[PDB]
Design a protein around this ligand. Structure first.
Ligand SMILES: OC[C@H]1O[C@@](CO)(O[C@H]2O[C@H](CO)[C@@H](O)[C@H](O)[C@H]2O)[C@@H](O)[C@@H]1O
Ligand SMILES: OC[C@H]1O[C@@](CO)(O[C@H]2O[C@H](CO)[C@@H](O)[C@H](O)[C@H]2O)[C@@H](O)[C@@H]1O
Ligand SMILES: OC[C@H]1O[C@@](CO)(O[C@H]2O[C@H](CO)[C@@H](O)[C@H](O)[C@H]2O)[C@@H](O)[C@@H]1O
Ligand SMILES: OC[C@H]1O[C@@](CO)(O[C@H]2O[C@H](CO)[C@@H](O)[C@H](O)[C@H]2O)[C@@H](O)[C@@H]1O
Ligand SMILES: OC[C@H]1O[C@@](CO)(O[C@H]2O[C@H](CO)[C@@H](O)[C@H](O)[C@H]2O)[C@@H](O)[C@@H]1O
Ligand SMILES: OC[C@H]1O[C@@](CO)(O[C@H]2O[C@H](CO)[C@@H](O)[C@H](O)[C@H]2O)[C@@H](O)[C@@H]1O
Ligand SMILES: OC[C@H]1O[C@@](CO)(O[C@H]2O[C@H](CO)[C@@H](O)[C@H](O)[C@H]2O)[C@@H](O)[C@@H]1O
Ligand SMILES: OC[C@H]1O[C@@](CO)(O[C@H]2O[C@H](CO)[C@@H](O)[C@H](O)[C@H]2O)[C@@H](O)[C@@H]1O
Ligand SMILES: OC[C@H]1O[C@@](CO)(O[C@H]2O[C@H](CO)[C@@H](O)[C@H](O)[C@H]2O)[C@@H](O)[C@@H]1O
Ligand SMILES: OC[C@H]1O[C@@](CO)(O[C@H]2O[C@H](CO)[C@@H](O)[C@H](O)[C@H]2O)[C@@H](O)[C@@H]1O
Ligand SMILES: OC[C@H]1O[C@@](CO)(O[C@H]2O[C@H](CO)[C@@H](O)[C@H](O)[C@H]2O)[C@@H](O)[C@@H]1O
Ligand SMILES: OC[C@H]1O[C@@](CO)(O[C@H]2O[C@H](CO)[C@@H](O)[C@H](O)[C@H]2O)[C@@H](O)[C@@H]1O
Ligand SMILES: O=N[O-]
Ligand SMILES: O=N[O-]
Ligand SMILES: O=N[O-]
Ligand SMILES: O=N[O-]
Ligand SMILES: O=N[O-]
Ligand SMILES: O=N[O-]
Ligand SMILES: O=N[O-]
Ligand SMILES: O=N[O-]
Ligand SMILES: O=N[O-]
Ligand SMILES: [Cu+2]
Ligand SMILES: [Cu+2]
Ligand SMILES: [Cu+2]
Ligand SMILES: [Cu+2]
Ligand SMILES: [Cu+2]
Ligand SMILES: [Cu+2]
Lengths: 338, 338, 338
């Protein structure tokens, strides 16, 4: 019945994004994606703490899907028989049937194919939602990602000017709720099911033990810092499926920010810190002006420094002393000072 | 002195709203409302937990009041002698005297009459605020509602087009702080006064035990789901007098959202999730496009699924397979799959 | 190399603000400021609880700095030898080097001079950020303030009309994490270093013990209420370097609100409650219409009434009975009432 060209997309692991066009002259297509659920124990912090994760495509977050307004998105969701739980998928980009969740519940050993029309532009969360208490549990165990629906003319500034990014990164933020024993040490389990009761008790108190980008503390620091160059316009997509976040690029700004994440709304300009509502994605464009290390955080600095929620950018280029300079390096306070 | 027509409004219990006009050609009126304080033990969750509530008009939230810009609102607040505490009312819609609180403190057995001019458009919180620590306590015990001040021309999209709703629902969200005994069981008390000291200790840790719509977990699910039809434009007013919330309509969107709640500002379009600041009301318009069950949540999914904060809509009509379809029902993963 | 006039600014203690022009016809200048770090024990609540604070200029918040777009800001940061810790400064207004933090680390006995160009308009946080876990610790110990970068034409309403304030106040909100002993009493320490381990444990649970304006519960109540007069347009700058806040003026509104704090964006109009993202500053203009006491709160009322986060305004002038009046004072409920 639906007679449009089909195009298979190969997803890539975050924080990278599969290749796509910004502006396009192609008409609507059926864009075909496959997501495979993987339950697995994962390391989440720099001390080696593990937890019983549940993922799309083996990553936290799940991969970013990119389509254009008016495309149809045909998703094959696979639940391998090595998994233990039923899973499904809810797309906040989609209309009807609980975002798709009501049409995609699959037991281990099954797969399902859902199609939804990309009628709404922006970045959106997708997440597992099997029903009842299993909804938060699957989400905070890692089963969430995002999809971006671009306008066919690409981004604009809300004032008639095109905006184009040179690079795009997807930062998925995950609140985790890892049980502790009586002495405070994190507990380990042999399966997600065995971890559930203790995990739910932590969840109920609404205070995460970890808040991480790309699935673990330090994931996007060190050798996995995000690269850019002075002069490049970088789009930073940020999602949080369960809990608020307040992104901030230390040493930079958000030149154009869609904090509610929806491209039918003009962006705000020149933000220091923006706000991702739990259950949403947002996006910020920034043109780097200075080289060096930048930290990208949630600006609850306790979360950023002590719970895991810091990423780095490493930016190559020449320093601009007009924008900032060290006029005088550290020196003894003058004896004459009053 | 004030020589305008008077009109008595009969309030109705949430989530329903008393009858009103959107656009009106009537001039300003004195709109007369009565609110009666009721302290009573109420059931707040599906396990039967009770707590010592304090309400306007016997409901959590208090009822939605609807007037138009330039009306005067004359409120008789009654504190029956069967109550134990003084009460008052603060309207965030009003100007002066702590929103009215400084003019409306009444002991059991008394009533008072306040008039305020509706100079500011939007949805607004009203709440009790007797002074000092009694302010949060009365609010989180249930004494809060909302008022909507419509423009006389009704709503608009901020771009010169009228917006009209076919149905309106008021979702009041309440954070509750129910004491527990040493084993974790919720405690019961014979009066609000007896509950206070233990409740204040829970409040101080800023983590609710329950987060509910319309006064209890499951209030707006099952037989009390909210009705709509495909094609209807529904206004969903959401308030939270004490704590942030992040509304989301699962399977839908916010077509036009005033998350800060004030109609002098253009709405945002096409939101997945919006944000109600504690101490405010906001509103979202959505035109249903698909039949079926929708969940309406705060998108902290722990709160939604495990603390009480889920409502349902039941929407009648025909399914649109263009917007979404199950291409292939659950099936065994092909043996040929790699 | 940089050949512009220099102008030394003398800072003043919050909530007051050093003298400045709104609109200016002066060209860019190098605006010279000095900040001196002071570690000291401070009283934070009305029961006399102390904690080991760390400050810029002896105050929480640090003082508000005011410049205009295109000025250069040359900051001498001094770390006296009576201090125990290294310190630095990050300006969210600045571009590069982690906002300046990477160029300003000074040990006790040292000073440093940083210059940054004020290319971005708005109110912005500044804060200490020495590295790693020391970043949140220094911030939540008090080392944060704000800077305002005005447009050279002063404020506007985003619709081509100038806005001018008659008075400006800076409200810095501070979340504090004071350790308790086994009985719940707050602990005291002889130095910040000695307090660190116990403080970090409180910080990790993300629940402050105190939330205060101008450095202590009750700081801006009583004899230190903020003054205004009916008819005056007052700008209220609000910052929070670590944690969200939801400002509300009880009995008033935000006539023009930049909740994200950046003057390149039009303000929202007629807000009841606004939202300061942790790690940012915002600003609200309000023209007082009624005399009397106003409370200015974060509208988590538990925080406001029970954790310290209430300020007062005392507004002189004549009452306007058209906007609000007590039609009938408290009286016995009629025996005839049903
Ligand atoms: O002996 C506990 C000690 O070992 C580490 C090793 O990196 O991790 C183990 O224990 C953790 C806490 O139970 C588990 O999360 C993990 O699966 C297990 O390898 C340390 O983190 C831990 O302190
Ligand atoms: O807005 C994007 C997309 O949403 C649709 C529904 O699929 O329309 C919605 O939004 C419109 C514009 O705000 C409303 O006029 C309409 O009533 C609502 O359904 C598409 O028609 C539109 O392209
Ligand atoms: O946090 C409580 C208490 O637990 C201990 C181990 O007994 O450390 C645990 O908690 C720390 C904070 O989350 C972690 O860094 C560590 O991996 C974990 O074992 C104590 O050291 C701490 O005091
Ligand atoms: O890119 C940052 C990096 O560049 C160096 C020189 O290689 O210094 C530049 O950046 C500094 C600010 O971080 C400037 O103060 C300096 O003048 C400029 O040359 C490195 O020192 C620095 O890590
Ligand atoms: O015996 C306790 C058991 O009874 C229930 C009945 O629905 O409720 C009682 O106890 C609750 C906890 O103290 C009270 O909140 C309630 O008022 C009382 O009827 C169960 O909820 C409870 O587990
Ligand atoms: O804005 C609605 C309503 O507010 C009033 C005060 O009652 O005016 C306020 O807002 C105006 C428009 O932003 C400001 O110009 C004015 O100074 C401020 O008091 C009414 O006059 C107006 O209709
Ligand atoms: O939550 C702590 C602990 O308390 C118990 C009873 O001892 O259950 C209580 O708490 C649950 C979570 O809020 C409620 O569902 C229940 O109504 C309440 O009695 C334990 O079951 C729980 O482990
Ligand atoms: O309204 C939802 C309701 O309608 C039924 C048919 O009575 O199925 C419709 O809705 C489904 C999506 O929820 C579609 O997949 C289906 O094609 C459509 O007929 C019920 O099964 C469903 O509960
Ligand atoms: O004896 C404790 C008692 O004294 C007060 C006096 O105002 O403060 C002391 O103890 C506090 C808690 O340890 C300290 O914060 C403070 O430095 C010290 O003077 C009371 O607050 C306290 O309850
Ligand atoms: O926007 C204020 C200020 O920012 C600068 C950079 O210092 O420009 C940024 O913002 C511009 C307008 O949004 C973008 O066009 C530009 O690419 C970005 O660097 C200044 O040029 C501008 O005055
Ligand atoms: O809060 C727990 C418990 O501690 C006590 C003293 O044992 O009071 C402390 O905590 C109160 C709340 O923060 C403070 O008002 C007081 O300054 C502090 O000592 C108990 O009174 C309270 O029950
Ligand atoms: O400014 C508030 C202050 O003024 C007094 C008279 O001196 O009363 C005025 O304000 C009241 C509202 O707070 C009005 O109801 C009254 O009509 C008006 O005169 C004081 O009573 C009040 O504290
Ligand atoms: O180690 N995780 O259960
Ligand atoms: O059904 N999911 O665990
Ligand atoms: O400026 N960053 O914390
Ligand atoms: O049962 N409530 O006190
Ligand atoms: O005074 N109110 O409890
Ligand atoms: O999409 N709702 O959780
Ligand atoms: O008393 N403060 O450590
Ligand atoms: O290095 N600062 O404690
Ligand atoms: O209206 N103030 O809580
Ligand atoms: Cu799942
Ligand atoms: Cu969702
Ligand atoms: Cu009350
Ligand atoms: Cu209020
Ligand atoms: Cu410091
Ligand atoms: Cu910062």
């Amino acid at each position: 019945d639906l007679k449009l060209p089909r195009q298979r997309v190969d997803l890539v692991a975050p924080p990278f994004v599969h290749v796509h066009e910004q502006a396009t002259k192609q008409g609507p297509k059926i864009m075909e994606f496959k997501l495979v659920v993987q339950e697995k124990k994962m390391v989440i912090d720099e001390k080696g703490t593990t937890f019983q994760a549940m993922t799309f495509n083996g990553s936290m977050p799940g991969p970013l899907m990119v389509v254009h307004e008016g495309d149809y998105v045909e998703v094959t969701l696979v639940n391998p028989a090595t998994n233990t739980m039923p899973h499904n998928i809810d797309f906040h980009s989609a209309t009807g049937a609980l975002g798709g969740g009501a049409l995609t519940l699959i037991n281990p050993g099954e797969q399902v194919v859902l199609r939804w029309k990309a009628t709404r532009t922006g970045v959106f969360v997708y997440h597992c939602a099997p029903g009842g208490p299993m909804i938060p549990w699957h989400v905070v165990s890692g089963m969430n990602g995002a999809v971006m629906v671009l306008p066919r003319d690409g981004l604009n500034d809300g004032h008639g000017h095109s905006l184009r990014y040179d690079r795009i990164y997807y930062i998925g933020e995950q609140d985790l709720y890892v049980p502790r024993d009586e002495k405070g040490n994190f507990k380990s389990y042999d399966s997600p099911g065995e971890a559930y009761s203790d995990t739910e008790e932590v969840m109920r108190k609404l205070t995460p033990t970890h808040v991480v980008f790309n699935g673990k503390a330090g994931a996007l620091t060190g050798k996995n810092a995000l690269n850019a160059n002075v002069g490049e316009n970088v789009l930073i997509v940020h999602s949080q499926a369960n809990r608020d976040s307040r992104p901030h690029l230390i040493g930079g700004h958000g030149d154009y920010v869609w904090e509610t994440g929806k491209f039918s709304n003009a962006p705000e300009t020149g933000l220091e810190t923006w706000f991702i509502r739990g259950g949403s994605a947002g996006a910020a464009l920034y043109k780097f002006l200075q080289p060096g290390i930048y930290a990208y955080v949630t600006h609850n600095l306790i979360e950023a420094a002590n719970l895991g929620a810091t990423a780095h950018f490493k930016v190559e280029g020449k320093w601009n002393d007009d924008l900032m300079t060290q006029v005088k390096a550290p020196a003894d306070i003058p004896t004459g000072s009053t």
